Design an enzyme around this catalytic site. Structure first.
Site, PDB file in Angstrom:
ATOM      1  N   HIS A  45    -165.101 119.171  68.242  1.00 45.67           N
ATOM      2  CA  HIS A  45    -164.433 119.919  69.298  1.00 45.67           C
ATOM      3  C   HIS A  45    -163.482 121.022  68.855  1.00 45.67           C
ATOM      4  CE1 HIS A  45    -164.069 120.044  73.655  1.00 45.67           C
ATOM      5  NE2 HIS A  45    -162.772 120.262  73.526  1.00 45.67           N
ATOM      6  N   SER A  76    -164.732 124.176  75.835  1.00 45.89           N
ATOM      7  CA  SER A  76    -164.206 123.024  76.558  1.00 45.89           C
ATOM      8  C   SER A  76    -164.173 123.271  78.069  1.00 45.89           C
ATOM      9  CB  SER A  76    -162.802 122.708  76.019  1.00 45.89           C
ATOM     10  OG  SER A  76    -162.199 121.630  76.712  1.00 45.89           O
ATOM     11  N   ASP A  88    -168.108 114.679  70.263  1.00 50.05           N
ATOM     12  CA  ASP A  88    -167.570 115.629  69.291  1.00 50.05           C
ATOM     13  C   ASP A  88    -166.093 115.365  69.022  1.00 50.05           C
ATOM     14  OD1 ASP A  88    -166.132 116.576  71.453  1.00 50.05           O
ATOM     15  OD2 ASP A  88    -166.861 118.642  71.317  1.00 50.05           O
TER      16      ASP A  88
HETATM   17 NA    NA Z   1    -160.374 120.863  74.878  1.00 53.26          NA
END
Ligand code: NA
Ligand SMILES: [Ca+2]
Ligand SMILES: [Cl-]
Ligand SMILES: [Zn+2]
Length: 387
Positions: free
Chosen positions: A357, A112, A316
């Site tokens: 994710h 991320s 995602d």
């Molecule tokens: Na994140």
């Protein structure tokens, strides 16, 4: 592929994330699947984990990562601190790898927003900060070596599901409340309640610079309400700002690829295209929070002014897939499809994986994703890189 370097791996989280002793031991890197750092170490790939402010700016996080690695007191820069209104010095770390000051190097694997932080740390090591250098001279104050420039210790940066061009999630109505609901959802995944005033920190947001911290007798619910109205959520010196399409482009204008570092990117997608207008929808198995609260918006939001069209709909559950292969908006970095040979100074697009994710780090389950194999294969590839 034969090992060509002995650089250890360093794991770096995104806008959620915590240290190994936090969350009662539930690991950000591994989640319900296990302990990724341990798997790598047990397989002969020395690995360490960084924990920086989840909501703090990439700049703040890079300064924190620097001190955590080489050791010392976090120094955000006299100019930066004065400009944004927070403390110049943060916490003090013993240093995970002091050898980096004598020639040692590392491979950073980031998830991320950790990908933006990793890129920025490299940029600062290589070029430092002219603004900080000038400010230190003019105000007769010390300067962190990080801002001097002419330093180098990152052999590679691997990003996983990183919003290099930002994520349109930030443009959702009620973003603010939904973002903190996401924080609560991650806490619940770690079997931690949000309506309990835990005496141990449990999840330290590391907001020393802003002078913020959960108080005795305060629950995460109450604390998050305060954070929403605090500078770490309302200023431009925040993860929130850097996460937006506009903020990410700004970051890309100065954070460029170093010719001395290998860059690898992994993209994620967990949606299907509908038959009505081509919008994208969450696939079965996507973590519940994203499937209900975020995916619908990500797969349907378009914004002419921002240039957000059809290519941005695949996602995602948190980040638009198109944003993940490498910085493009406001960037001069080059991106090339992985051809079997990893190259320095460019983004090696390792492909797109059908994992969401949170599944990619094990925080959400997905039996069909061999997470252990994924990280071991990556560790082996990194170890094969010529120095
Ligand atoms: Na994140
Ligand atoms: Ca799942
Ligand atoms: Cl406080
Ligand atoms: Zn700052």
């Amino acid at each position: 592929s034969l090992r060509a370097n002995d650089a250890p791996i360093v794991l770096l989280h995104g806008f959620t994330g915590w240290g190994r002793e936090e969350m009662f031991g539930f690991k950000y890197w591994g989640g319900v699947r296990g302990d990724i750092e341990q798997w790598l170490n047990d397989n002969g790939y020395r690995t360490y984990t960084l924990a920086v402010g989840p909501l703090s700016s990439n700049w703040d996080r890079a300064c924190e990562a620097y001190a955590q690695l080489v050791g010392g007191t976090v120094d955000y820069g006299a100019a930066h601190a004065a400009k944004h209104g927070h403390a110049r010095f943060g916490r003090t770390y013993p240093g995970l790898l002091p050898e980096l000051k004598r020639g040692g190097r590392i491979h950073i694997i980031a998830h991320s927003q950790g990908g933006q932080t990793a890129r920025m740390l490299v940029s600062l090591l290589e070029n430092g900060s002219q603004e900080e250098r000038e400010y230190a001279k003019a105000h007769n104050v010390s300067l962190s070596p990080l801002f001097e420039g002419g330093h180098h210790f990152v052999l590679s940066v691997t990003t996983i599901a990183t919003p290099h061009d930002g994520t349109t999630l930030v443009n959702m109505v009620d973003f603010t409340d939904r973002f903190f609901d996401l924080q609560k959802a991650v806490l619940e995944a770690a079997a931690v309640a949000s309506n309990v005033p835990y005496t141990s920190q449990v999840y330290d947001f590391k907001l020393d610079q802003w002078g913020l911290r959960r108080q005795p007798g305060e629950s995460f619910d109450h604390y998050f309400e305060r954070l929403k109205r605090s500078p770490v959520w309302t200023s431009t010196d925040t993860a929130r700002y850097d996460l937006s399409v506009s903020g990410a482009e700004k970051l890309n204008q100065w954070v460029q690829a170093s010719p001395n570092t290998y860059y690898l990117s992994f993209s994620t997608e967990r949606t299907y295209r509908g038959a009505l207008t081509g919008n994208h929808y969450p696939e079965l198995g996507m973590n519940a929070f994203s499937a209900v609260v975020c995916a619908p918006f990500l797969g349907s939001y378009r914004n002419p002014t921002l240039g957000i069209d059809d290519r941005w709909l695949e996602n995602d559950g948190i980040v638009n897939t198109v944003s993940m292969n490498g910085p493009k908006r406001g960037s001069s970095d080059r991106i090339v499809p992985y051809d079997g040979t990893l190259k320095k100074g460019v983004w090696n697009d390792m492909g797109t994986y059908n994992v969401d994710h949170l599944e990619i780090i094990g925080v959400d389950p997905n039996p069909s994703f061999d997470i252990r194999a994924f990280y071991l294969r990556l560790a082996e590839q990194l170890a094969s890189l010529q120095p």
